[PDB]
């Protein structure tokens, strides 16, 4: 009756769009596809590579629950955008928690400055940093035991572009993209960027606040023409890329990957 109408609004009330409500129960595993059901129109064709943790083997059997992501519906049949992105929100919450007490305390091990700043990795993911943040002072972890264990103390974050730089050592110590597009510019600032779609001439890695990069086809590897990008890297993966070139005018930042 209005039973059903009340239920419809109830079920509205007890779900949300993003990957927030850990609801999808893993109802079939086979390699290389995991599948869930989060109260959506269809079941998600999940990769296995969203769900192996830090050493390469699976961690969740049948019945286990992780939320995924939404706001994109039915490319022709199916439902979702993947769940690790959901994990990105949890990582963002942990990073924000710092604000409360002005200190987020984890493990942070930064061996080398990709784009000027040491790379700091939190449990599964690894993020890239600006130079100063790796070290509180000129200490320079190159003389520290390789991949050492301290923490991360935040020096700098870009706040729209997920670039976060953190201070590994020294426990005692405690429109918009295109006007000032000179930050990752100079010649060779490398970046950690997720690829989006490979257009058979390109890969379209683009992460840094609403920009677009192309590592198109020529570099990508150390073979030129017989390469077919889909075979050689991935879909949806954070990689080594750097700028190599910027247009601020015709908005074509032409990244590379042969580096």
């Amino acid at each position: 009756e209005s039973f059903a109408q009340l239920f419809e609004e109830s079920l509205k009330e007890i779900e949300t769009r993003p990957g927030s409500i850990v609801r999808g129960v893993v109802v079939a595993i086979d390699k290389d596809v995991v599948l869930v059901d989060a109260g959506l129109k269809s079941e998600s064709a999940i990769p296995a590579e969203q769900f192996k943790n830090a050493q390469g083997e699976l961690e969740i059997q049948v019945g286990d629950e992780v939320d995924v992501a939404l706001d994109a519906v039915e490319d022709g049949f199916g439902e979702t955008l993947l769940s690790r992105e959901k994990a990105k929100r949890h990582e963002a919450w942990i990073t924000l928690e710092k604000a409360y007490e002005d200190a987020e305390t984890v493990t942070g091990v930064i061996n080398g400055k990709v784009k000027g700043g040491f790379t700091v990795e939190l449990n599964g993911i690894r993020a890239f940093l600006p130079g100063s943040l790796v070290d509180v002072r000129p200490v320079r972890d190159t003389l520290h035991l390789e991949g050492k264990e301290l923490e991360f103390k935040v020096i700098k974050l870009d706040q729209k572009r997920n670039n976060v730089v953190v201070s590994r050592r020294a426990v005692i110590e405690s429109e918009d993209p295109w006007v000032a597009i000179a930050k990752r510019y100079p010649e060779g600032t490398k970046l950690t960027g997720r690829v989006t779609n490979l257009t058979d001439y390109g890969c379209f890695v683009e992460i840094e606040e609403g920009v677009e990069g192309l590592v198109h086809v020529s570099e990508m590897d150390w073979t030129n023409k017989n390469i077919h990008p889909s075979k050689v890297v991935n879909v949806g993966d954070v990689v080594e890329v750097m700028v190599l070139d910027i247009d601020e005018e015709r908005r074509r930042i032409s990244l590379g990957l042969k580096q």
Binding site: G76, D245, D247, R250, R252, S254
Partner: protein, 70 residues
């Protein structure tokens, strides 16, 4: 496409940068289009036909993609 060789920059790299700049400008294409005169009708026809081709490529092939080849 004005360019200046940076200090301790290789020549070949500089040439490559220049070529890229030219490509961006579309100078060669510009020249090609202005070699002789195109009738307005012809210009219109080309533009329209190109758009039609683009639309075909966007939609019909997508539809085809839905179905598997083998």
């Amino acid at each position: 496409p004005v360019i200046k060789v940076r200090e301790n920059e290789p020549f070949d790299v500089a040439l490559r940068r220049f070529k890229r700049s030219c490509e961006k400008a579309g100078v060669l294409a510009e020249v090609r289009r202005r070699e002789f005169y195109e009738k307005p009708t012809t210009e219109r026809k080309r533009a329209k036909a190109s758009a039609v081709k683009r639309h075909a490529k966007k939609l019909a092939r997508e539809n085809a993609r839905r179905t598997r080849l083998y």
